[PDB]
Amino acid sequence: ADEAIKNGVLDILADLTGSDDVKKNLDLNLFETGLLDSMGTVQLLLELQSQFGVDAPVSEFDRKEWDTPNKIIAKVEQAQ
């Protein structure tokens, strides 16, 4: 279906890290890779709450789900 989401989400991912590593790998630990820190997820959320209008937690989300791009790409699909 909507591919502007899977793309945008990913596009926002590669942009998040700043490398074309996640642009491919669909299991690149955004944490174990050091590509992410914390503020990144916050921002991405801002973008995931605008183009996707997601409603994910922050106080203490499941980094496990926000650890990978796939886990997220799914979290975005399980929000629409």
UniProtKB/Swiss-Prot annotation:
GO MF annotations in UniProt: D-alanyl carrier activity
Chain ranges of the Carrier domain: 1-80
Pathway recorded for this protein: Cell wall biogenesis; lipoteichoic acid biosynthesis
Modified residues (O-(pantetheine 4'-phosphoryl)serine): S38
InterPro entries xrefs: ACP-like_sf, DltC, PP-bd_ACP
Keyword set, alphabetical order: Cell wall biogenesis/degradation, Cytoplasm, Phosphopantetheine, Phosphoprotein
One of the Pfam families matching this protein, by short name: PP-binding
Gene Ontology terms: cellular component: cytoplasm
SUPFAM superfamilies xref list: ACP-like
One of the protein's GO biological processes: cell wall organization
Domain of life per record: Bacteria
Posttranslational mods: 4'-phosphopantetheine is transferred from CoA to a specific serine of apo-DCP.
Localization per record: Cytoplasm
UniProt family annotation: Belongs to the DltC family.
Function noted in UniProt: Carrier protein involved in the D-alanylation of lipoteichoic acid (LTA). The loading of thioester-linked D-alanine onto DltC is catalyzed by D-alanine--D-alanyl carrier protein ligase DltA. The DltC-carried D-alanyl group is further transferred to cell membrane phosphatidylglycerol (PG) by forming an ester bond, probably catalyzed by DltD. D-alanylation of LTA plays an important role in modulating the properties of the cell wall in Gram-positive bacteria, influencing the net charge of the cell wall.
Record protein name field: D-alanyl carrier protein
Phylogenetic placement of the source organism: Bacteria, Bacillati, Bacillota, Bacilli, Lactobacillales
